[PDB]
Symmetry: D2
Subunit: 180 residues, 4 copies
């Protein structure tokens, strides 16, 4: 029975099964781990403390309607509140996203979003505690592209608090090198 | 582009994409719609108000870990709180479920659970408002090699269809009685 | 420093300080402990596991706008979702509430609501665990009346899972005896 | 009947009712407005849309346990997750805070925190919509024997007032620098 928790986007048309009964699956809009979302956290706590799942994959995707909607900033109603976390992420990386041509930002934000969600998952009390008590647990952030059908392990792979901080830092720095 | 929102369980072996790009998908433990879950409510509000999705399917499944875990009631930690809503639904139907033999109880609760979550979904401000302003929106509760319920198209048919599912489930087959 | 967590209503005009720096305070609409509300649960977990607060009081009040709004069933918007938990409580006790004259139901629902929130608090993983590991912890449900300025310890006092189940049962049964 | 919503901290010694039946009150740990907290959002939506409350006050306080706990970063369990939003705000202002001496850092974060939570409140769909439809609504961020900030009346003045509070807080008194 299952060995991977995958956290993926609700509007991704590639299923996690296809892009990988190994799988325990959470999906939400823009593949978020929000610090205080009982729904995702519950899932994570069950996967780690009960099922002893040893890999968590957060998978984003290009051409993601949740990302595009966080960026366009329309009055969508309740979902805007959900998407504000992604807006906080755009402004965390505002200088970086402003250098790019505007048809290119969404795909940058999509990758940055994945790194930030991994960083959040790694910071939950649940994952911190598992790493502190010796439990073998790895986090991964991937981004999938259906323009291709293909994948990028998005620079973020973490196996301890140490490797989370480092791999988070370097993913962002690797994303800050710009294709002319 | 998407025409269906599927709310399904995180431990389900099968992709909701059994049954491609017509699906918008939310997965959580025991396929719940909790009145006040920002995560599931956000998905529903976006599907309905923004994407104009005209069908919401809550799809449960038999041999559900989350259902079993809610009944075993061990100290699992945080997930126990999430599963408390499942234990409320168990006690709402305690006389019913006690009339089954032990080994049949899980699969009944799985079925009851779907009906209850459809009732919740239909009582959201999101869905009630969409029906009140004439939007076409149908809700479905299914249980997943076949798909074995509840079907709503308005607040009156939600009430009808929920009460019928429960009465229908209250009628016990000999092979299930204790 | 503090020895009581009080959970009270956001629209109550009597403050918990007055009706009791002893106090750590949570307030929300209709003084709820909802199973999966990270906000209240957080508070409870901190009070019990960190501050080692030994008493939790849930205090309701008569003439409570949250209760009245759950009962009238207007399209209020987002808050209706919050108040649905209270609607589930009305229907848990529908036969009992139908016997009463309609000008009397709200005050009955207010008291029943308090018993149900205590029962929920007692069922959290946090409180179950504290009782299981020997920690001294008492729960109380009170209802305050500003028609009077006065109090009723609403039949629900709990110090273990055992006393929670019992005291919950008897509170409801005591509330089911009707004043002709 | 009520004219003020007060969002204050659960560990505050003083009743928000220092400063009677004019107050509708929400209390949580470190007086947060988290974008997706159903509890606080519900209160705000009811105050604004239903009770027609024209003022929202986020009132923080010095010597705040929740702020201290977020900075100490011990393994407290569930509450750590709630306090993570506070640590995000710390790191958003990491260069600022690192320029203070250690024993002054808490009280700066308390002040920053209020400003950040007012910014959150002003960016809610609830508040943005109320401003967009012309409703009179002002937001305030205060820190509590005196009341030592941010004041918003529209989305443009929210932006102005938030940026000014942060720049104003960035100007360091000699007695606070390290
Ligand atoms: Zn997406
Ligand atoms: Zn399942
Ligand atoms: Zn009240
Ligand atoms: Zn405080």
């Amino acid at each position: 029975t299952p060995h991977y928790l995958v956290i993926a986007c609700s509007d991704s048309r590639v299923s996690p099964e296809k892009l990988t009964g190994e799988l325990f699956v959470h999906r939400n809009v823009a593949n978020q781990v929000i610090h205080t979302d009982f729904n995702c956290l519950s899932v994570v706590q069950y996967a780690v403390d009960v099922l002893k799942i040893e890999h968590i994959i957060i998978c984003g995707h290009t051409n993601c309607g949740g990302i595009h909607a966080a960026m366009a900033d329309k009055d969508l109603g309740l979902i805007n509140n959900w998407l504000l976390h992604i807006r906080d992420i755009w402004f965390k990386h505002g200088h970086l996203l402003g250098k790019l041509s505007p048809e290119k930002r969404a795909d940058m934000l999509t990758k940055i979003n994945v790194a930030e969600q991994v960083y959040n998952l790694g910071r939950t009390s649940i994952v911190k505690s598992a790493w502190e008590r010796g439990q073998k647990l790895s986090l991964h952030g991937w981004v999938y592209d259906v323009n291709d059908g293909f994948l990028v392990d998005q620079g973020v792979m973490a196996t301890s608090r140490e490797t989370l901080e480092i791999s988070y830092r370097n993913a962002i720095a690797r994303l800050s090198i710009l294709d002319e």
